[PDB]
Design a binder for this molecule. Structure first.
Ligand SMILES: CC(C)(COP(=O)(O)OP(=O)(O)OC[C@H]1O[C@@H](n2cnc3c(N)ncnc32)[C@H](O)[C@@H]1OP(=O)(O)O)[C@@H](O)C(=O)NCCC(=O)NCCS
Ligand SMILES: CC(C)(COP(=O)(O)OP(=O)(O)OC[C@H]1O[C@@H](n2cnc3c(N)ncnc32)[C@H](O)[C@@H]1OP(=O)(O)O)[C@@H](O)C(=O)NCCC(=O)NCCS
Lengths: 353, 375
């Protein structure tokens, strides 16, 4: 049975505390005259339940690429040139940390699954990571582009069958990375479905190693991937929409998505999402803690977020002397979701600590 | 063991014969005054071994979206809006025919793998195909974007593990679609490795059904997917390059790609099929992505192949051009269609073992080891 053997994460070094972000955002987009819209944005940020976010797109990067901060200005080329380079580079940081925990050389890897919705190129981000990391030429790559916030969970669904159908030496590296260079837009009071993303979207990378039939002397599983299934919610196509255009990506968020969309890993799409899960199942406050923590400290990073929460859960479980990597519990589930609307459900089993 | 259970194809209806294409291309891009460059493009087309190509992008479509025909003008929005709608639509035409050959209802599908390098959107072309085919909401989707000409082979590699690890009821629909709306560019005498693409790139859709543990009663395999491996050729990054930009995609082709690829897949052949005990190189069948004529000649010359061994690959090049992802599936279909029609004893031209090579940016090679099925 396939297992997660290592997890690690990375973020851009520039921290944006949410208390300061309305002032930063309306200043760098030169939109301070929009006082009513800033009031609304202040309330969005205050209700976001996000304490800080790590972002590539600083004031200096906007100054170097000024059309990124001018609504509707052509800036797709400028965003692309940044992201084709920087997305694999941040992924390499998380990947090498995961491989160090794993304890095996890159030569023991058989497969790479790379996921991002931040930039497209040919050859793709999977190839670029293999180049800058020095993955051997027999490492077999799968590129998952543009699948938004269920990409992390979908990589585990794919890795399960690859690991289990090819045998004991198959070892899959999963790397998920996003940079909001892809979809950062200046404010407009007729596009509130773009403005909500400015309050909650953020940058990050996470990596994991998956294998089956483990060398017990050298490898140690963290979780087992019991089953994985994707479903689509009917009649919800307009809930999450990303239109890649000459002005960059316009990523539209509907107000109904949370209303439509054991230990738990729930993609932190926003606070309404995590609350929807809690009261619906009578969950203790303890159950969503790890998902609430990643939302607070990193925001909604699309693809990699469920791996951040996975890593946070087993770390706290170990630090607090819990019985298993799943907070002392045996069974668990991870939910990724995104455009479609699409739900990826991954049934997990913890490991004894 | 995973098997291909159905194969079908579709193309945009408008046919461009290669003898007429230099005239059309320089006229609709209002570039006839570039006389030396047009002579160069004529020679490119005359050497291409392409007789016709099916294209979505007609003169009317360019007239509706005139920046597509103006070099470096912003046209990415216009291209995107066309392809996000039209890529799934052409895929549905092929997919319906593959399911009809398969013979089972859509409700028996468990998975969909959609592959394209022609447009990006969220939700993507996989969701859109599901919606317009009315696939049940439990069909599990994988979207393979931007993998160029190895995408059809990579879909088989993925589908093998999905079908074999989940078992007898898992049935995977594969759909590969391309429309050169994505990268059509007007001519420039300083971007010649752009003009090559206008001589060879074309449009098409192919669909296949993959499953393991077959209902002998109702399902018949065409080919078995014995193994599949991707490899990367070191120090070949610049061989095939697609830069997606505000003017659309600029798809650059280095002069040495056919030889770098051809030498590599000859080596893969020797490395892979010698331990399987294939006695000589004419004793196995071949599907080689039709990137151009030179890569097909290399296989023939380096392995000493007879003329019938690359015939199916030459035919798809002649009649359809280089359609990127779906082309290897066109060739698979053609091979088994002619094998049946000509009275051969197997779907692989009367031979037991065979190879499929997809390749593309990286440079990346997807090798698929195939076994035919008795006819
Ligand atoms: C957006 C969100 C953080 C707001 O926090 P909240 O707990 O709902 O608190 P509020 O209802 O007071 O909302 C605060 C402001 O945000 C607005 N708002 C909330 N959701 C919005 C949405 N999809 N689009 C535009 N504005 C929205 C509210 O109208 C309000 O502005 P106002 O006071 O001027 O009317 C929260 O609703 C949420 O988690 N949304 C989920 C985002 C999502 O869909 N994630 C998954 C897709 S990636
Ligand atoms: C277009 C094509 C059919 C021309 O046929 P050919 O076998 O090269 O015949 P020639 O060598 O006489 O080339 C004719 C012209 O095309 C030019 N040319 C060919 N390939 C070129 C390239 N990558 N870049 C720039 N110019 C090129 C040659 O310089 C030559 O110019 P000239 O006649 O003015 O001297 C062939 O080059 C081809 O198929 N290229 C694509 C192969 C490839 O890269 N496949 C991978 C993509 S999936």
């Amino acid at each position: 049975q396939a297992a997660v053997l290592a997890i690690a994460t990375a973020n851009p070094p520039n921290i944006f505390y949410q208390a300061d972000y309305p002032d930063f955002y309306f200043r760098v987009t030169k939109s301070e005259h929009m006082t009513q819209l800033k009031d609304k944005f202040k309330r969005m940020c205050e209700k976001s339940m996000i304490r800080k976010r790590h972002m590539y797109l600083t004031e200096d990067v906007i100054k170097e690429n000024p059309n990124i901060g001018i609504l509707n200005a052509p800036s797709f080329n400028a965003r692309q040139e940044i992201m084709v380079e920087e997305v694999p580079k941040l992924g390499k940081e998380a990947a090498l940390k995961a491989i160090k925990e794993w304890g095996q050389p890159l030569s023991k890897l058989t497969h790479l699954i790379f996921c991002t919705s931040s930039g497209v190129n040919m050859p793709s981000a999977d190839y670029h990571l293999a180049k800058i990391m020095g993955l051997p030429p027999y490492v077999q790559r799968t590129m998952i582009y543009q699948q938004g916030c269920f990409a992390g969970a979908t990589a585990l669904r794919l890795a399960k069958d690859i690991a289990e159908n090819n045998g004991g030496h198959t070892r899959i590296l999963i790397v998920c990375v996003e940079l909001m260079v892809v979809c950062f837009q200046a404010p407009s009071d007729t596009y509130l479905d773009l403005l909500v993303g400015n309050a909650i979207f953020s940058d990050g990378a996470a990596a994991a190693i998956v294998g089956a039939d483990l060398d017990t002397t050298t490898e140690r599983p963290i979780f087992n991937i019991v089953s994985a299934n994707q479903t689509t919610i009917p009649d919800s196509e307009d809930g999450i929409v990303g239109h890649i255009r000459e002005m960059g990506m316009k990523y539209y968020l509907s107000r109904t998505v949370p209303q439509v969309i054991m230990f738990y890993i729930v993609h932190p799409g926003g606070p309404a999402v995590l609350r929807m899960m809690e009261e619906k199942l009578g969950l203790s406050k303890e159950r969503m803690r790890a998902s609430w923590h990643v939302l607070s400290e990193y925001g909604n990073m699309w693809g990699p977020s469920v791996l951040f929460i996975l890593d946070e859960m087993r770390n706290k479980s170990m630090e607090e002397g819990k019985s298993t990597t799943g907070e002392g519990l045996e069974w668990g589930v991870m939910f990724g979701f995104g455009p479609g609307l699409t739900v990826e459900t991954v049934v997990l089993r913890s490991v004894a600590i």
